Amino acid sequence: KKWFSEFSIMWPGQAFSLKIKKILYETKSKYQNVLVFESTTYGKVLVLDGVIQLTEKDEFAYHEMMTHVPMTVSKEPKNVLVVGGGDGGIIRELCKYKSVENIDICEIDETVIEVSKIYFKNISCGYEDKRVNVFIEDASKFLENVTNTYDVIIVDSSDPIGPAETLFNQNFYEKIYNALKPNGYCVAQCESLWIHVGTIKNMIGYAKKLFKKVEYANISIPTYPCGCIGILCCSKTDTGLTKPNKKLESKEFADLKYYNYENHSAAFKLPAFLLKEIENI
Amino acid sequence: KKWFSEFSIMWPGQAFSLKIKKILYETKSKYQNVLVFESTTYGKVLVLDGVIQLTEKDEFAYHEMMTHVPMTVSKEPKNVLVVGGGDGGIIRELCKYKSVENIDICEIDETVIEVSKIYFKNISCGYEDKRVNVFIEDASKFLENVTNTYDVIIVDSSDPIGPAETLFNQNFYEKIYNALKPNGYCVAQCESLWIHVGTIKNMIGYAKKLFKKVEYANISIPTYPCGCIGILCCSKTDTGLTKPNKKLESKEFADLKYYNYENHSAAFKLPAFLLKEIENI
Ligand SMILES: C[S@@H](CCCN)C[C@H]1O[C@@H](n2cnc3c(N)ncnc32)[C@H](O)[C@@H]1O
Ligand SMILES: C[S@@H](CCCN)C[C@H]1O[C@@H](n2cnc3c(N)ncnc32)[C@H](O)[C@@H]1O
Ligand SMILES: C[C@H]1CC[C@@H](N)CC1
Ligand SMILES: C[C@H]1CC[C@@H](N)CC1
């Protein structure tokens, strides 16, 4: 069998590889190269522009922490926006909340959505839900135009190289600011503390220019570079996102595989070198 | 430039790779294959039997958490044992404690020690310290013979395949039990929650057969398989290892890069699926 290997200039001098059972689908969409394969040990794998975006084995770590962090802090969230997140993992976790009334998803590339509906039926099952509304558009354009404001905005983008390039700037964070309710929350995918401290420092400067509370958490996920991924957490109220305001005790949440009440706060407890870097910001 | 790739049957279907700047030393010692290279982005790298044992870039994460967890719980530790840990990283962190009077290290392979003294002079610098006593021996034999008992025992072994094979059993944990003071602590290297739950379940059954409190913590380290490594924490008193009994505030600790008072407790906050697996044990 052959191996898929994940090289990038965004993590120079290192690579992570998975063994391929069979290749399932490959294409050049309007925005990116799309690859789906079955791996021998991580289940099916979505690769976009050569970078692992998700695998069946560990996807729940990122989707649960990205969703249930902000959704346990927001008191009664009604209107939620997902930016990117074509695969549907976030949406799946959002549908567990009976209080949610609407879920807008703004994803630039419909190939991602359709591929996910076909090959990742346990991830993309949230699309069945009547509350979900799909907009195929650059979130950068979408956030300049939206009329609604949102209780939570979850930014589940790919890397700064490619289509997500328009989301890694000051102007984008202003649009997130204006699209949020007076007391709303944003969580954004924010790279790895092991290799991307320059970027984390930028993203935090952008956010702090606008939000009352910017906080950074970290998720263990083995198929992302360095085995972890940060979440940039932005708050309009002074309280922030480190403390859950509810426990997830209904039958909808009995199946949670990573998130719990205790590791919500823990994820915000960062290595010493990172804290040293991010407090003259 | 060529790439070093880390394959193993202990993590089938995945591999992590580093780019090689130059190979520094290679040998077949009495127990294992030894390789030292300079990588392009992770500094120098020690590989033993084809498995990355440490790199300069992230070694502090594992050494600080392995050492300062138990050393902040032990009230006034005088006599500390390191099992394995030929490179000297643990010893370096132990020497920061002015209360420590003796440090025995039991390492099977002196090639590891000497290679570390030559190529990893920032890791192996603790060997200068007059309190350190080196025993070249299988820890399995050493613990059956030692006359002293220890305040802390830190088990900083390699994987169950090879020389460390004798350390992954019930009998070994009895020897650790008998070599500890009435109120002493053991911390042992305990594989990755992402791939080694079978093993974690075994190690915990062995420990719980003997110790009042067995607890598991987790460290983010990018150059180990899945980007993380667990610590099996064993206690003879009912309190356990989750809570520091001191802050590391003296000039010796001003340089700490990972460990702090807050992420000591956080590391013990495990993903939901792992907790589900380890409590009918
Ligand atoms: C599939 S998801 C992978 C993470 C696991 N939930 C990453 C998505 O970000 C989308 N993306 C990237 N850039 C944009 C922009 N600019 N706008 C909207 N969506 C985007 C991209 O098409 C992926 O589907
Ligand atoms: C270098 S250390 C790497 C982790 C970073 N501190 C791993 C050590 O475990 C030793 N080891 C392995 N098995 C044993 C036994 N059985 N006894 C003592 N030491 C051992 C092995 O020689 C490495 O030096
Ligand atoms: C969701 C994102 C996808 C690309 C990154 N490299 C990891 C996390
Ligand atoms: C210290 C140990 C070395 C081998 C393991 N695979 C990672 C952690």
DSSP string covering chain A = --EEEE--TTSTTEEEEEEEEEEEEEEE-SS-EEEEEEESSS-EEEEETTEEEEETTTHHHHHHHHHHHHHHHSSS--EEEEEE-TT-HHHHHHTT-TT--EEEEEES-HHHHHHHHHH-TTTGGGGG-TTEEEEES-HHHHHHH--S-EEEEEEE---TTTGGGGGSSHHHHHHHHHTEEEEEEEEEE---TTT-HHHHHHHHHHHHTT-SEEEEEEEE-TTSGGGEEEEEEEESSSS-SSS-SS---SGGGTT-SS--HHHHHHTT---HHHHHHTS--
Residue A250: partners with Cβ closer than 8 Å, 6 or more residues away: A98
Count of beta carbons in the 10 Å neighbourhood of residue B172:
20
Q: Which residues pair with B214 in a beta bridge?
A: B234
B226 touches chain A (CB under 8 A): yes
State the Cα–Cα distance between residues A205 and A197, nearest whole angstrom.
Answer: 12
Contacts of A126 (CB under 8 A, 6+ apart): A88, A90, A91, A92, A93, A94, A95, A132
CB A220 within 8 A of CB A207: no
Beta bridge partners of B25: B36
Torsion sign over Cα B124, B125, B126, B127: positive
- Min Cα distance A193 → chain B (Å) is 10
Residue (of B253, B233, B240) closest to B97 by Cα position: B253
DSSP E strands: which ranges in chain B? 3-6, 14-28, 33-39, 44-48, 51-55, 79-84, 102-107, 132-136, 150-156, 180-189, 213-220, 228-235
φ, ψ of residue A10 to 5 degrees: the values are -85, -20
Compare CB distances from B266 to A227, A256, A269 and report the shortest one's residue.
Answer: A269
Single-letter code of the amino acid located at A159: D
Closest CA to B112 of B147, B158, B150, B168: B158
Record: contact A256-B272, CB cut-off 8 A: yes
Say what angle helices A197-208 and A170-178 make with each other, to 10 degrees.
40
The residue written with tokens 């099977």 in the block is: B108
How far is residue B198 from each of residues A45, B162, B163, B172, B202, measured CA to CA in Å?
A: 24, 19, 21, 18, 6
DSSP helix/strand/coil, B232: strand
- By the CB < 8 Å criterion, does A40 face chain B? yes
Q: How far is the CA of B84 from the centre of ligand 2 (A)?
A: 3
* Spatial strand order in the sheet of A228-235: A132-136, A102-107, A79-84, A150-156, A180-189, A228-235, A213-220
**Which domains, from first to last, does chain B contain?**
1-57 (2.30.140.10), 58-281 (3.40.50.150)
Looking at beta carbons, which pairs linking A243-247 to residues 24 or more positions away fall under 8 Å?
Answer: A243/A73, A244/A72, A244/A73, A245/A72, A245/A73, A245/A74, A245/A75, A246/A72, A247/A72
**Is B195:B11 a contact under the CB 8 Å cutoff?**
yes
What B140-148 contacts at long range (C-beta under 8 Å, 24+ apart), as own/partner pairs, is B140/B166, B140/B167, B140/B172, B140/B175, B142/B83, B142/B106, B143/B83, B143/B106, B143/B172, B143/B175, B143/B176, B143/B178, B143/B179, B144/B175, B146/B81, B146/B104, B146/B179, B148/B79, B148/B104, B148/B179
Place of tokens 């394969």: A37
φ, ψ at B270 (rounded to 5°): -95, 155
CA distances from B219 to B125, B156, B187, B225, B270 (A): 23, 14, 13, 12, 11
Per DSSP, B278 falls in state T
Q: CB-based contact (8 Å) between A271 and chain B?
A: yes
What is the whole-number distance in angstroms between the Cα of residue A159 and the centre of ligand 3? 6
- Which residues, 6+ apart, have CB-to-CB distance to B207 below 8 Å? B173, B214, B232, B234
User: How far apart are alpha carbons B61 and B72 in whole angstroms?
Assistant: 16
Query: Closest Cα to residue B142, out of B116, B112, B110, B104?
Result: B104
How many residues does the structure list for chain A? Answer: 281
B264 three-state secondary structure: helix
Torsion angles phi and psi, residue A189, rounded to 5: -55, 125
For residues A150 and B99, what is the distance between their CA atoms, to the nearest angstrom? Answer: 56
Q: For residue A40, which of A4, A15, A16 has the smallest C-alpha distance?
A: A4
- Centroid of ligand 2 to alpha carbon of B102 (angstroms): 20
Report the C-alpha gap between B228 and A128 in whole angstroms.
Answer: 36
Q: Does B65 touch chain A (CB under 8 A)?
A: no
| Catalytic-role residue among A138, A156, A159, A238 | A156
Rounded to whole angstroms, the Cα distance separating B157 from B142 reads 14
Give CA torsion, residues B39, B43, B46, B50, to 10 deg. -30
Q: Return the H-helix or E-strand segment holding B114.
A: helix B110-119
Residues 6+ apart with CB under 8 A from B3: A15, B17, B18, B19, B20
Identify the bridge partners of residue B18 per DSSP, sorted by sequence position.
A14, B4
For B171, the enclosing helix (H) or strand (E) is helix B170-178
Instruction: Please say if A156 is a catalytic residue.
Output: yes
Instruction: Output phi, psi for B182, to 5 deg.
Output: -50, -35
Chain B residues within 8 A of A17 when measuring between CB atoms: 5, 14-17
Say how far residue B128 (Cα) sits from the centre of its chain. 20
- Separation of alpha carbons B193 and B201, rounded Å: 10
Cβ-based neighbour number of residue B275 at 10 Å: 14
Given CA atoms A184, A189, A194, A197 in this order, what sign does their dihedral have?
negative
Residue A152 and residue A121 in contact, taking contact as beta carbons nearer than 8 Å: no
Spatial separation of the C-alpha atoms in residues B167 and B165, rounded to whole Å:
5
Q: Is A156 labelled as part of a ligand binding site? A: yes
Side chain identity, residue A135: F
Give CA–CA dist A159/B178, Å, rounded: 52
* CB-based contact B157:B190 (threshold 8 Å): no
Which of B108, B156, B161 has its CA nearest to residue B135?
Answer: B108
Kindly state the tokens that stand for B184: 């002493």
**Interchain pair B40, A16: CB under 8 A:** no
Searching chain B, which residue's CA lies closest to the CA of residue A272?
B258
CA distance A152 to A101: 12
Q: Is the CB of B11 under 6 A from ligand 4?
A: no
Please state, in angstroms and rounded to a whole number, the distance separating the CA atoms of residues B24 and B39. Answer: 10
Q: Residue B90: CB partners within 8 Å, gap ≥ 6? A: B63, B66, B67, B82, B126, B154, B156
DSSP H or E stretch at residue B272 = helix B272-277
The CB density around residue B112, as the number of other CB atoms within 10 Å, is 26
Q: Quick check: helix, strand or coil at residue B40?
A: coil
Residue B175 has φ and ψ, to the nearest 5°, of -60, -40
Q: What is B185-206 written as a DSSP string?
A: EEEEE---TTT-HHHHHHHHHH
